[PDB]
Amino acid sequence: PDITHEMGTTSFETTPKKVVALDWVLTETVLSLGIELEGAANISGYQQWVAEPHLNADAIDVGSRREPNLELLSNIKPDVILISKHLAAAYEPLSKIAPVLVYSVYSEDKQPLESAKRITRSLGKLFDKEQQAEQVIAQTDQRLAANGAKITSAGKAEKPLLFARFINDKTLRIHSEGSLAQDTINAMGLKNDWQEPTNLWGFTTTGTEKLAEHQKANVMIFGPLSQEERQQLTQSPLWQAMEFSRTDSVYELPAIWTFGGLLAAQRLSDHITGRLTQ
Template identity: 40%
Template structure:
């Protein structure tokens, strides 16, 4: 049985389930969505949606880019028997229909196919990453809304409480270690001369803010929350710690170790280069927690003069 939850979500829900079989309607980016009962067979067409369902304890019957999820997102783990329905940019409508879903979760990137998807099953459209959006708040909204739709409001609230508790614990660890005194630059290497640096308008900013850390890179990025730039831009992040997020380009450490430019950087000279495992920067709420733990561990363990 469903209970009502007072959460403002894109115009909010219009009705509440009070008994099995009673309809509830939500507004979303694609219009309105009405369900007569909690959906059980759900297809997720992006990884943020896949992650969100798994956090709710729901195994989707089908996902897009299944292999990629296991490589890049990893947590929460996706069971091996989940069907793959094609790519995130061009899923197979036939494969989706064969699964007989009673709910499809997608984003506005799939707008051209929205009407076709709705012919298969009710379709919930929410985009975590759009111009001027706040990714964590949008991901939080998706979690709470899907919690409503599936009768798992308590589970959704518990997930959010756990994330906030973890963030608080990691902040306390950093403060006790005296490691909130310097800004942090979060980046991936594209090659030995180019980087992707994470900006204040991205998902990772929630992690930094919650840990009491400032972002060494203050310029705005794209709506995905990063800027692609040359390695020389790191020189502008003075008096900061540089955190390199996996995966690394093969041979990168050796290339950087012999680079006069790299070895000149203050963070390199101060042994303040840190490396953390891969986290998916374009996901839902969970990467915020995962990065917080990895980042705190890395800072406490200490830095080096290269990306070993």
């Protein structure tokens, strides 16, 4: 019955049935184990930026990731509330409503894939889904290796990758050390063209002029992009001047969460493999 999390040890004499997750990677992880959410933070955002796996029908929006709705959470009476250390200032208030477990995929460890495995195992214990947890972990490692072997065998692993989130006309997040994207492509035997320092989420915020020092890369642009965002890239003199634009070496990915878990890594791996070996 005793579960350890980042704020100590909690006992559950029955598996918690009504589950709230207050970040999207914990939402993804709960869903990865075949468990439904009573509530999740910012469902319209999860739908836009995460997309899969699909949240269950009856899931209630319990506030923003930064501002949980305490009145609503009190009314819906969860059996467990899942947060990261990024919401630790809400630990004691949420604790008055229900048992709170603290799990952080993104920490100063900067090993998101390994953290998501550790956390998939803890939540597998919490929900009596340990076998399902071990298979999500094994299938993640299987898919990365197999996709890596395919890309390498096709002679497509030699060109380095640049992973970019569009922020505005003049601003990008480039994903490298500590990013889900980097843990994924490292496992697939690919090279990151970005070697600048990153925050604990695994990205550097940069100007778009920095792309000029990375023209030999295959550029992967995270989805989704708005019509206005995509027109800004299509029409930008800077982007159209870059070698990767002239050599058809720019790929727009679908909506896959850059701060997601094992299922995000699986989907990102599949889509990269598709684009590089089509």
